Structure 1
């Protein structure tokens, strides 16, 4: 039970989920691509993205931390901090 996590697996899974989004062209996004500026997404798109990542990883990100998750690298770092990986 409870297999461990790494930054490589977290980044691969978060990029998988963001790649399955129809509003993002998969050949353009990267680990540090912004949402409002570099990808042209609304705030509701950011909210739906955050909810998708919550459903993917199975734990809830609070709103006061969800408003500041703006690129995939910050999502990776937030999940890594919340789940205490690379110990």
Structure 2
């Protein structure tokens, strides 16, 4: 079943494994590009990984609305319903 823990944990799994960074750098208010150093290319791959992982499609506009991990987490929780 859907759960916030599932979102955050899975989200960290993609970002952490591809960047080699611990969730300490990951924050609901931390920016993936500034706080972690993941540029637009990095961001596309990370969100994409969630796109297939959660079996959901994302809006290019949603990407613009998503900057921090908080947005990533909140996005999946609401997008799935």
TM-score between both structures, scaled by the size of structure 1: 0.76
Change (3 A) 1:44 1:81: same
Does residue 34 in structure 1 map to residue 31 in structure 2?
yes
The count of residues paired between Structure 1 and Structure 2 equals 80
Considering Cα pairs closer than 8 Å and 6+ residues apart, tell me whether 1 or 2 has the greater RCO.
1
The 3-state SS of whatever aligns with 2:57 is coil
Higher helix share: 2
RMSD: 1.8
Q: Partner of 2:41 in structure 1?
A: 44
- The alignment's TM-score, normalised by the length of structure 2, stands at 0.80
- Larger of the two Rg values belongs to structure: 1
- Unaligned residue ranges in structure 2 (runs of 5+): none
